[PDB]
Structures are given as structure tokens and as C-alpha cells.
Design an enzyme around this catalytic site. Sequence first.
Site, PDB file in Angstrom:
ATOM      1  NE  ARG A 140       1.003   1.369   4.202  1.00  0.00           N
ATOM      2  CZ  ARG A 140       2.325   0.658   4.480  1.00  0.00           C
ATOM      3  NH1 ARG A 140       2.811   0.279   3.083  1.00  0.00           N
ATOM      4  NH2 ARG A 140       3.006   0.964   5.355  1.00  0.00           N
ATOM      5  N   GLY A 141       0.622   2.245  -0.514  1.00  0.00           N
ATOM      6  CA  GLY A 141       1.145   3.645  -0.686  1.00  0.00           C
ATOM      7  C   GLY A 141       0.139   4.491  -0.467  1.00  0.00           C
ATOM      8  CE  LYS A 142       3.462  10.149  -0.296  1.00  0.00           C
ATOM      9  NZ  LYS A 142       4.508   8.940  -0.012  1.00  0.00           N
TER      10      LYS A 142
ATOM     11  CB  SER B 210      -2.760   2.555  -4.991  1.00  0.00           C
ATOM     12  OG  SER B 210      -1.416   1.909  -4.965  1.00  0.00           O
TER      13      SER B 210
ATOM     14  CG  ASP C 134       9.069   7.347  -5.666  1.00  0.00           C
ATOM     15  OD1 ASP C 134       9.666   7.780  -4.547  1.00  0.00           O
ATOM     16  OD2 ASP C 134       7.677   6.914  -5.766  1.00  0.00           O
TER      17      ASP C 134
END
Length: 328
Positions: free
Chosen positions: A42-44, A46, A151
Site C-alpha cells: 500500500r502507498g499513500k 493506492s 522516485d
Amino acid sequence: MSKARVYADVNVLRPKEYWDYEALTVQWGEQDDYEVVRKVGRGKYSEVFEGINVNNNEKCIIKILKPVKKKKIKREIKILQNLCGGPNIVKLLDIVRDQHSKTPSLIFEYVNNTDFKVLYPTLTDYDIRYYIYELLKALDYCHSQGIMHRDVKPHNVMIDHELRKLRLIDWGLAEFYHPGKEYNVRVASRYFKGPELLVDLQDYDYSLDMWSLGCMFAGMIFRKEPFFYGHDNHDQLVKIAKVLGTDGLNAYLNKYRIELDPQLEALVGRHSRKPWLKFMNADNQHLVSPEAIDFLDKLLRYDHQERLTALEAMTHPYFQQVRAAENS
Ligand SMILES: CC(=O)Nc1cccc(Nc2nc(Nc3ccccc3)n3ncc(C#N)c3n2)c1
């Protein structure tokens, strides 16, 4: 004014359709073709699940996007489509949406990745050289396509250690490079943000990714992740300066006619440069060879213009055995 030393005119001679990602027209597949097996990340921006393509019964990765502006999502998609089949570039399989909420999900190839927090520590000197090398093919390839990943970090480097297969993933923050354009500097993850980003130098280029790669390479051989462990953007620039010294910084600043700010400039202070070997102990001594240091030193340069290019890095003597291996 600053620009790129290589691949600077890729998006130029290229038709507008290649980089005009806003003119993209998403061709949606069928959401059902993919079923969520289990969550994996999970990421901020998705949630990520291992999935299965109901037709072929093969594993896949489902990235369920969170409320993202449509422009942003066309960028991550267009870039992905543009890099398909590139060396070690994660492959985008499908683009689907939930009819009711219109929630979109990007389907990506599946990689049985081993968390870096656990993987990296067991890698051998040669493994490191090998995987960095593979990561370099991905960077040189996208840079040659006019794209900055912006990134780079372990979390975005999927490695199936068993198959020794690697893929550069998550091109959400990625961007097209245009000669002279300024860019938001709130990209990459603090621990991998290049000095340019920490000093508000807006007109950066592919170089940014080589600094990040360098941070990644540093943490690996020196076994200290993250390498530049700061608490915030200001603390990030400071933690760096306490290593490369403030003179290189001052020179950096003065060369681009940039000016820090009171608290910042005052926060940094004054620091002598600390040699790379001052970071060698007994948990990494078997990984900090001269070629490693020479290679790292050529990546972690204040001036993004001095840093090695992806193409040059792959030829550095550090990777000679990997290359010789490849030529067989
Ligand atoms: C998907 C994306 O853009 N970013 C994103 C954000 C957070 C986590 C992830 N996670 C994530 N994880 C895996 N594999 C995996 C992870 C742990 C155990 C087993 C398999 N993969 N494999 C391919 C992609 C791909 N592509 C991917 N993304 C991806």
C-alpha cells in the site's frame, strides 16, 4: 539555467503524442478478468494486491488507485505504455475501472518480491553488483525515452531473488523531461531526494534518479538503510551536508545562483567532508571495496551535472564481472 547533459532532446524530435499524455484516451478492459487474491502493499496513493487473471489463471498485481486527478493517472499510464518491453521495466497488463465508483485499477505483471528490509541484508557482494546493474538498465532505458522516474527507492525495486529477476515499479511520480522546464520538488521519498530538491532547484533532470540510486547503493554496501536518515526536508539537506561537507554545497548553491533560507542555512551550519571509508565497519567491510567507493562517490555529487549518467555507470569497472558474465 540548468539542463540535461544527455537525452535532453528526446521528447523534442518525438511527436507530441508520445509525451502529450493529456491527449491519451484510456481503453478500459474488463474489471472481472482479475480477482484479488491477497494484499501485499500500500502507498499513500493506492492499495496493492496479488491477483489472478481469471482467464489464464496466472498471477498478476492489482494496483487500486485512490482518488487521483485524471491528469495524473494519464501520466502514469502513458509513461508505462511508452516503456513497455524496456529492460527491467515493470510491464503494465491492463487498465480497468469499477462501473459504480469509477475506481480505476492498473494491472501489472506479478513479481514474487522479497521485502528489501529482509532481502538486502543477505545479498552477496556480487548480488549487489548484479542487481544494481539491472536497475541501471532500467534507468538508462527510461532516461533514453525522456522519462525521469523521480522516485527511486528499494520499495520500488521488485526482486524475485530465486529467479534473479528485477523490475523497476510504480511510475506514478515519474515525469517526461523537457529542456528547461521547472518541476515540483516534493517528489521521491525524503531519504532519496536529491540535494536539488532540498534546495528548491526546480529545473532538474534524469540526474535526480542517479542520486537516489546512489543513496540506495550506499545503504546496501554500508548496510545502513536509509543512508541519509533525516526527519524532514530541512533535516534531509543537513544530514547530507554532514557527509559531503558544506563547501561542496556552497559551491553547488553559488553555481546555480540559488540561496538557502535563514533557518535552513542556519540549520545546516558548517561541516567538513567525511570520507566514505569512515562508514566502513564489520557488518559491511566485505562490501566496501575501492571500486564500490569510487562508483558511489561518482553518484553522490551535490551538482547533478557532475553525477554519472546511467549509461556511464553501467560501464564503471565495479560492474566488470557482471558484464563479463553477460557476454557469455
Ligand atoms: C504497483 C505500484 O505502482 N506500487 C506499489 C505500491 C506499494 C506496494 C507495491 N507492491 C508490489 N508488490 C509486488 N510484489 C509482491 C510484494 C510482496 C510480496 C509478494 C509480491 N509487486 N510485484 C509487481 C508489482 C508492480 N508493479 C508489485 N508491487 C506496489
